Amino acid sequence: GAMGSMERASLIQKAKLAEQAERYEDMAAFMKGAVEKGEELSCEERNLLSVAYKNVVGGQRAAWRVLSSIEQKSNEEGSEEKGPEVREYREKVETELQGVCDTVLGLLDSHLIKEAGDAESRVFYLKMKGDYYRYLAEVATGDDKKRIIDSARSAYQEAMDISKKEMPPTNPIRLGLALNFSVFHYEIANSPEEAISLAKTTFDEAMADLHTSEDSYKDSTLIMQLLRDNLTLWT
Amino acid sequence: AMGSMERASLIQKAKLAEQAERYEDMAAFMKGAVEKGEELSCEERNLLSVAYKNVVGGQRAAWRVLSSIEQKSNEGPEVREYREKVETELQGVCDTVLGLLDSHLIKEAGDAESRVFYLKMKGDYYRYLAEVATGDDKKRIIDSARSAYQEAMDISKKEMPPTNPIRLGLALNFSVFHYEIANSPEEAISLAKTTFDEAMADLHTLSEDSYKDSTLIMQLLRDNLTLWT
Amino acid sequence: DRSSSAPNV
Amino acid sequence: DRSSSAPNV
Numbered sequence: 001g002a003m004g005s006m007e008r009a010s011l012i013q014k015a016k017l018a019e020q021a022e023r024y025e026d027m028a029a030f031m032k033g034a035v036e037k038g039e040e041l042s043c044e045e046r047n048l049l050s051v052a053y054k055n056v057v058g059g060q061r062a063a064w065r066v067l068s069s070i071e072q073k074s075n076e077e078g079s080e081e082k083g084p085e086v087r088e089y090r091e092k093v094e095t096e097l098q099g100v101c102d103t104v105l106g107l108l109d110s111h112l113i114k115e116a117g118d119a120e121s122r123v124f125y126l127k128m129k130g131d132y133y134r135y136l137a138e139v140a141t142g143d144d145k146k147r148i149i150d151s152a153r154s155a156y157q158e159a160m161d162i163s164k165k166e167m168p169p170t171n172p173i174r175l176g177l178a179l180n181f182s183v184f185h186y187e188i189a190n191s192p193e194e195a196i197s198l199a200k201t202t203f204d205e206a207m208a209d210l211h212t213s214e215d216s217y218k219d220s221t222l223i224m225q226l227l228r229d230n231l232t233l234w235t
Numbered sequence: 236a237m238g239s240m241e242r243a244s245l246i247q248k249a250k251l252a253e254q255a256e257r258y259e260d261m262a263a264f265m266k267g268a269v270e271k272g273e274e275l276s277c278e279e280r281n282l283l284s285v286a287y288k289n290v291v292g293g294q295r296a297a298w299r300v301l302s303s304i305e306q307k308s309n310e311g312p313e314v315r316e317y318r319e320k321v322e323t324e325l326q327g328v329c330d331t332v333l334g335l336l337d338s339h340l341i342k343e344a345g346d347a348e349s350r351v352f353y354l355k356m357k358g359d360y361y362r363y364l365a366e367v368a369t370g371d372d373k374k375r376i377i378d379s380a381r382s383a384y385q386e387a388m389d390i391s392k393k394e395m396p397p398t399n400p401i402r403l404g405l406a407l408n409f410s411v412f413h414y415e416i417a418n419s420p421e422e423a424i425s426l427a428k429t430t431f432d433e434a435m436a437d438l439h440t441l442s443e444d445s446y447k448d449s450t451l452i453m454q455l456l457r458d459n460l461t462l463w464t
Numbered sequence: 465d466r467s468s469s470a471p472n473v
Numbered sequence: 474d475r476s477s478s479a480p481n482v
């Protein structure tokens with residue numbers, strides 16, 4: 001409810017409880033409140049913020065996809081009598097999804113991106129901005145779609161530029177960014193050539209430095225496997 | 236604005252929400268459909284039941300996690316406060332379901348199958364309230380669950396065959412009530428064993444459309460009996 | 465283990 | 474399949 005007066009440490013503790021309870025909407029709200037306390041986030045805290053909102057929007061995206069498929073199948077069949085209910089319900093889910101994306105983008109703009117000290121956290125938040133514009137782009141139509149795509153591209157490119165200057169090629173944040181930007185190219189921007197070349201370069205450059213911390217090894221190698229899987233799917 | 240949608244459109248949207256795994260929406264649609272004032276079909280009762288059981292199921296699982304953490308901690312105020320918040324939301328949903336059963340669904344008329352189904356559901360949602368209740372209110376809640384289940388049992392024994400899936404599901408849940416809520420393991424085991432045996436004795440008369448469901452409930456009776464003995 | 469009640473059909 | 478993006482760690 002009224003989180004402005006709540007102890008920041010209490011909001012983080014409650015976000016962790018909500019995570020254990022698989023209450024991701026609550027978790028997200030707690031982390032929004034924590035962000036709004038106005039301090040920078042730690043690593044753990046970025047992870048909580050990310051997990052919470054990705055679970056919420058993940059659910060909405062999955063539901064949207066089901067409904068869109070039913071809508072399209074219905075319309076294609078073209079029966080004089082079916083279609084209005086699924087359209088309206090798809091629009092309801094879509095509106096809710098857009099609302100969550102707008103919340104995340106608002107927090108990034110109002111609190112997180114400007115206030116980040118270090119390059120690593122700046123890249124993480126710019127990546128997140130790219131991702132939530134990408135989720136808006138999945139459901140956008142027409143001219144709004146073009147603007148949204150441009151916004152995603154701009155955020156990702158800025159992140160990429162920083163990451164190449166400031167972070168090693170095996171850094172999990174740099175890897176996750178490159179993976180997601182390649183997905184943007186393929187799925188959103190209809191640029192398969194760019195997707196494939198970014199994914200291949202990312203994979204190869206990470207492999208070349210793989211011999212250098214065990215603390216990041218599991219995360220980095222998991223992203224490299226997803227790059228490989230995408231490359232197999234795309235070729 | 237559920238009330239501004241036609242009944243057929245509310246049912247259609249409940250089915251869509253089911254496909255999308257959006258159970259809160261599904262429940263809201265089914266509540267609107269109930270409020271149109273027509274009886275529900277079997278299919279439609281199943282939609283209502285699935286929707287609300289999924290919602291409260293999530294709440295119950297979350298409550299159990301938080302309650303466990305709370306109890307381990309006791310062995311700051313945050314876990315109590317958050318457990319209380321989840322608990323209040325769970326009670327809200329149970330109250331919504333119980334309100335609909337009372338205001339719209341439970342009636343003196345209609346076939347025995349639907350009467351027993353709704354009385355069973357009343358017992359279930361009082362049982363979910365009992366899981367979280369502490370104090371004097373707990374005794375009242377337990378009595379309400381018992382009364383609902385017993386009335387359902389009495390109807391089912393007079394009016395329905397022993398292998399009917401609604402009769403079976405009711406007996407299974409009433410046995411769970413005895414074991415987990417009412418501190419009555421002897422009655423739980425006796426009810427489950429009698430239910431199982433009487434159902435198996437008449438299984439050869441059960442229609443094929445009920446076979447899968449009835450056999451699943453009989454398996455759960457067997458598994459509970461193994462757990463309890 | 466918790467007792468099992470009737471599942472969603 | 475859809476492409477895979479970065480998961481929850």
Ligand SMILES: *CC(=O)NCC1CCN(S(=O)(=O)c2ccc(I)cc2)CC1
Nearest residue numbers: 043046047172173176219222479480482
């Ligand atoms: C130290 C830190 O800043 N926090 C952990 C982050 C959350 C998730 N990101 S990510 O979205 O870039 C990502 C990379 C790799 C994997 I496996 C999952 C997510 C990384 C930093």
Ligand SMILES: *CC(=O)NCC1CCN(S(=O)(=O)c2ccc(I)cc2)CC1
Nearest residue numbers: 277280281400401404448451470471473
């Ligand atoms: C014809 C009918 O009234 N509808 C289907 C019902 C919904 C669920 N109930 S139940 O809760 O008693 C139940 C029985 C068996 C199983 I497997 C699951 C639930 C049955 C009737």
Ligand SMILES: [Cl-]
Nearest residue numbers: 088089092248
């Ligand atoms: Cl709708």
Ligand SMILES: [Cl-]
Nearest residue numbers: 014316317320
């Ligand atoms: Cl709380």
Ligand SMILES: [Mg+2]
Nearest residue numbers: 006007008009
């Ligand atoms: Mg302080």
Ligand SMILES: [Mg+2]
Nearest residue numbers: 077078079080
């Ligand atoms: Mg037709």
Ligand SMILES: [Mg+2]
Nearest residue numbers: 091094095139
């Ligand atoms: Mg729209």
Ligand SMILES: [Mg+2]
Nearest residue numbers: 119166167168
């Ligand atoms: Mg550096």
Ligand SMILES: [Mg+2]
Nearest residue numbers: 240241242271
């Ligand atoms: Mg009407």
Ligand SMILES: [Mg+2]
Nearest residue numbers: 319322323367
């Ligand atoms: Mg309470």
Ligand SMILES: [Mg+2]
Nearest residue numbers: 341342343344
């Ligand atoms: Mg009378």
